[PDB]
Amino acid sequence: MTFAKIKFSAQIRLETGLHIGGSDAFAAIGAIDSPVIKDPITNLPIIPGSSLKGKMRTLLAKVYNEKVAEKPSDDSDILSRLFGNSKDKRFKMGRLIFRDAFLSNADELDSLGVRSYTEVKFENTIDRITAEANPRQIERAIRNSTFDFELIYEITDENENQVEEDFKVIRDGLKLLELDYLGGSGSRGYGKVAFENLKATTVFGNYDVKTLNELLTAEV
Amino acid sequence: MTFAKIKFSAQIRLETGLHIGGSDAFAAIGAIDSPVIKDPITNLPIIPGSSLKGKMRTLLAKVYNEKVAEKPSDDSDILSRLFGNSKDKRFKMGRLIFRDAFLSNADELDSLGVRSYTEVKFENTIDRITAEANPRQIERAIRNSTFDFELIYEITDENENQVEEDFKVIRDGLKLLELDYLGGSGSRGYGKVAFENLKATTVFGNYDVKTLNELLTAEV
Amino acid sequence: LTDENYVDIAEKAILKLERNTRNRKNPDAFFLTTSKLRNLLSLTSTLFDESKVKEYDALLDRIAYLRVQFVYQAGREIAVKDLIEKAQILEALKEIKDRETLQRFCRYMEALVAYFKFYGGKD
Amino acid sequence: TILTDENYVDIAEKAILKLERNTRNRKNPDAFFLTTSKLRNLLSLTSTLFDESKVKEYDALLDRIAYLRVQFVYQAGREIAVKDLIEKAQILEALKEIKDRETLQRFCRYMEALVAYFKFYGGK
Amino acid sequence: NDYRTFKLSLLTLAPIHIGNGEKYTSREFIYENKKFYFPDMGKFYNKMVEKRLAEKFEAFLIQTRPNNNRLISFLNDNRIAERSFGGYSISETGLESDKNAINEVNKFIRDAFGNPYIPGSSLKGAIRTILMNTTPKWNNENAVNRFPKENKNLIPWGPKKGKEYDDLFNAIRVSDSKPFDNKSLILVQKWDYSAKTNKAKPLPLYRESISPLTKIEFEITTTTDEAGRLIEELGKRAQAFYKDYKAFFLSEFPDDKIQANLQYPIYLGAGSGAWTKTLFKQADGILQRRYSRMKTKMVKKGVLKLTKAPLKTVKIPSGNHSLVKNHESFYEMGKANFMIKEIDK
RNA sequence: ACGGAAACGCUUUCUAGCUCGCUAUAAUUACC
């Protein structure tokens, strides 16, 4: 199948508060919380593509390897094919490109009457012997935020069957992330997220996306 | 048929953080970072033309070769014509001159109140058995940065129809860069790039650009 | 008023700030805790962050809200009201005509907090 | 007075030597309380200042020298080994004494020197 | 289909108040008609700027050096007829009494948007003390090295170098609640029943809490077998923990006060007291020792915590199942019950 | 009627590939 690029686009909607990244650089003077990864220029939360790729890959290893997979070098050819493998000559360059996702709906939220685009959640832990409480604050990207999502798939030397299987793997990946969380304090209910208006477009070359679009909207 | 020089100009906007870099032992004494390539006098990020040319060329080989070329010497006459081929007498000198791109909007950013032109992105890796986390900092040129882009095309000894084909290849190249990344940690969301205000201008000789300007405002 | 040599002012205020001198180790012993400030600092920073892509004319609701929580919190805890006095913050707020003036005030808050933490404030 | 062209590096070295070390570590030698991670966001700002001292003129960067001072005290507030550093190395005084691009660039270099000799004599 | 998912429905049998850190002051609201008035201090300010009242409002608010009348009195002192700024007011139950009174109230935890919700973090806390108090493997230890504390290596949870990632509680994920309509909030008061006094003397503390007979839903996912077959028996284990906690504590207080148990019990978040938030077995001697010398933890065990709330008591199991037994309108604070399910795939 | 005329130290080459800033933690205990 002669070269082509299919662009998977969606909006990530945060169903619960999300917390990813950041450091004491991006920090506000007198912030006491664990801050979030932010776009430096707008100081808005951003969902780093590194995160999305990471989580989707490690979840997909549980499904698609049927192997121990001690290090990502050891993943199956089907995952290495998509996410890339540094130690295999064939897969040194991967067919997927994840993109930093940026907040769309700031205006929607400003309308809904938010006084910031990030919430700081107070939590604590209560000692079970002494009953003493130790509190903690942590920043989260606010609930019902949306982020414009882009993932790029490259058809080069993979003729007929392989593109189909790859599409299956991408849909399985996203669904698995929907049935999991985007890295945060996930066990305590963070990072639940949903892919809205998930849609395929051929942005280079010639390919038929009718079948895929059907399979995306319903089956993911 | 005659001689003329056309200047393709645009503004490259960084849609995400960009990382080229790689002088480690010539790095700032600062702290840990994988540094990015910088113009020595201003210490600002630079997009080296070598990078643009390289990436655009290897992208375009996937479209325009229609037989896989072991070496860049083995690229098609259409690519050799444009980017140069050291081992073909005809194409030893290529019709394209890429230029180091420099940060244009320093003033725009200083107005928006930015305190650095590069962010440090904090990432980690999770051991797939031990669940242990190994963290990693890596430098990017900040997201809404813009760079002056310049590419020079030389018409000598080409059928006006050959000039047409060349223009097709240039537009395909730029679009392919837009649907890919500028070399970085690309699979993890880096190096997304856009060409704004893209226009051709004949700066030497006489050539008619009006039709081309229309067509490349169409295809970006 | 305050501008462009305001760090020196911020400091000059903070060294004047109220002290719990009773404590056995009561050095300066500030009565104040970053905890008390937090909300209005998240507010001030969100104001700065916001004034970059919006216009001084159309923000002023949020500047009311800032003054409000200043006074409210000034009521709710004594050391806050004390701070707002000795650093003349409430005088400063009413004085904000330009986006230049506003950004200056945001910076001022930053400075106050920095020198608070420096001089043995407890966060 | 404090920072001279002949002066700075020898001072920086002396400061890194006089710095607070963890004597409570039986296992460790002279081992520093201070840690590059604490300085990172600070000396990033120093470097952006030096880098811009070439492309802009002194007055244009007053805002920057403001925000430097702030961050310094803030970090000295938040970390004990930081306060120790900027104490022993007279940092804040050294900022006060900067009227000049010559003086400014000298301070940036001063930080460079401090950090070099920090890492040299045991680091993060 | 590879995980397991459980859907847990929480019916509140009493006011539940987890809450954030903030608390409304007697100057920020107005008791006027059935409902309490909770404005947006912002919108107030900007209508009082539009009324040329602002400088008064400030000097009134900044006037707290322990202000002894500070209320919506200041309104009435001015013209104060306007009253359309701010949203969501709470209705006067008559309980939490003495009105005309309330000096201070504790806000319930509300999300970004101003709606309140039950953070899965807090529910997980309570699920934890249930799971902990049952399982015999963990019910025997604390650290003595040094006033005592929780062992905190009792359940391995971190990444260990060279070991196969054993962390059980990472494999139990507790959903954040949805936000719920702020119209179910109540303003329950704290009353402490001491069976030494054998009377119940009301304390000066008000908690905005969830009105009883509310349903609130949660989802809980497990990514490991042990966690699957742990949350499986959350029913058994819940009722077992209540067995021990009655036998230990409730069963030494007048049966009037003990609430009846309807589905499966949980103590969640409130001033429901120390034993709900501990391994009470092992906590006993130590916890007491914590309150020697001040306002004492006077009984050898605790006081029992009660609240005045409207007797809703409507639940129908072939008659009046009336929630609380007693007649002085006494629910047991932060008492709720639940039912857990299993979905599929 | 200068050991001197004439002669670009040039043509080709992405500082790239792989890596979730992650891991337990009810905003809570006490009321003579």
Side-chain angles (χ1 to χ4, degrees), chain B residues 84-88 90-126:
Chain B
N85 187 328
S86 43
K87 308 295 178 49
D88 191 326
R90 296 162 293 164
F91 313 113
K92 284 215 162 132
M93 301 230 290
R95 312 201 184 160
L96 289 170
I97 292 164
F98 294 90
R99 307 233 128 159
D100 285 357
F102 299 92
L103 186 86
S104 61
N105 62 349
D107 293 328
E108 197 212 46
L109 303 167
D110 302 342
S111 63
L112 278 179
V114 305
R115 294 171 269 191
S116 164
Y117 300 99
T118 60
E119 82 187 289
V120 192
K121 202 193 159 173
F122 290 78
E123 313 185 338
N124 80 328
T125 206
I126 312 166

Side-chain angles (χ1 to χ4, degrees), chain A residues 68-69 72-86 88 90-114 117-129 131-138:
Chain A
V68 201
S73 336
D74 296 326
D75 285 355
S76 61
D77 290 11
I78 172 69
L79 279 175
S80 294
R81 193 203 310 173
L82 279 158
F83 297 80
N85 182 328
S86 148
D88 201 341
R90 306 162 76 171
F91 306 116
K92 268 230 171 134
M93 224 126 293
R95 315 199 185 154
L96 288 170
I97 301 165
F98 294 89
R99 308 221 123 152
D100 285 359
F102 294 94
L103 182 150
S104 326
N105 60 352
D107 290 328
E108 197 188 14
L109 299 165
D110 205 79
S111 134
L112 280 172
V114 302
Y117 302 97
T118 58
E119 80 196 320
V120 310
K121 196 180 168 177
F122 280 72
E123 307 170 23
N124 76 345
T125 200
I126 324 161
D127 186 307
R128 300 284 156 82
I129 298 284
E132 290 160 316
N134 220 98
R136 82 200 189 255
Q137 357 180 169
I138 84 172

Side-chain angles (χ1 to χ4, degrees), chain A residues 29 43 110 117 122 137, chain C residues 38 46 49-50 62:
Chain A
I29 310 134
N43 200 262
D110 205 79
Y117 302 97
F122 280 72
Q137 357 180 169
Chain C
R38 63 178 92 259
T46 316
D49 287 328
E50 206 61 72
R62 306 150 91 91

Side-chain angles (χ1 to χ4, degrees), chain B residues 20-22 24-66 68-88 90-128 131-157 161:
Chain B
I20 295 184
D24 223 331
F26 287 84
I29 275 158
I32 339 162
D33 257 331
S34 64
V36 307
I37 182 85
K38 305 188 175 81
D39 163 57
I41 184 45
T42 68
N43 202 15
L44 296 184
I46 192 194
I47 303 190
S50 36
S51 283
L52 300 152
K53 183 179 182 189
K55 192 50 137 70
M56 177 176 311
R57 179 186 185 131
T58 72
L59 277 178
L60 276 165
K62 302 188 158 76
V63 171
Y64 275 108
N65 278 1
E66 271 199 291
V68 80
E70 289 210 287
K71 330 147 206 170
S73 323
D74 302 2
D75 286 351
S76 64
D77 294 11
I78 310 175
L79 284 180
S80 296
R81 183 201 304 157
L82 280 155
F83 293 80
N85 187 328
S86 43
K87 308 295 178 49
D88 191 326
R90 296 162 293 164
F91 313 113
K92 284 215 162 132
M93 301 230 290
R95 312 201 184 160
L96 289 170
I97 292 164
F98 294 90
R99 307 233 128 159
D100 285 357
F102 299 92
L103 186 86
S104 61
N105 62 349
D107 293 328
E108 197 212 46
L109 303 167
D110 302 342
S111 63
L112 278 179
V114 305
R115 294 171 269 191
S116 164
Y117 300 99
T118 60
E119 82 187 289
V120 192
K121 202 193 159 173
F122 290 78
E123 313 185 338
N124 80 328
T125 206
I126 312 166
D127 186 312
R128 301 272 281 270
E132 299 169 275
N134 217 88
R136 166 182 92 215
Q137 317 78 61
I138 85 176
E139 186 167 10
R140 299 192 296 178
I142 68 180
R143 163 166 143 242
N144 272 317
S145 299
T146 56
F147 293 78
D148 296 305
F149 176 67
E150 193 163 315
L151 167 69
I152 304 300
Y153 181 76
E154 200 194 46
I155 323 171
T156 71
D157 179 39
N161 210 74

Side-chain angles (χ1 to χ4, degrees), chain E residues 101-102 104-114:
Chain E
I102 292 293
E104 204 183 66
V105 177
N106 283 7
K107 281 168 143 283
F108 194 87
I109 187 178
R110 323 214 201 196
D111 81 358
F113 297 134

Side-chain angles (χ1 to χ4, degrees), chain A residues 168-180:
Chain A
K168 160 141 197 47
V169 170
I170 301 173
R171 296 179 267 112
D172 283 358
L174 295 138
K175 200 153 204 140
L176 258 96
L177 198 132
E178 292 206 306
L179 308 170
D180 198 291

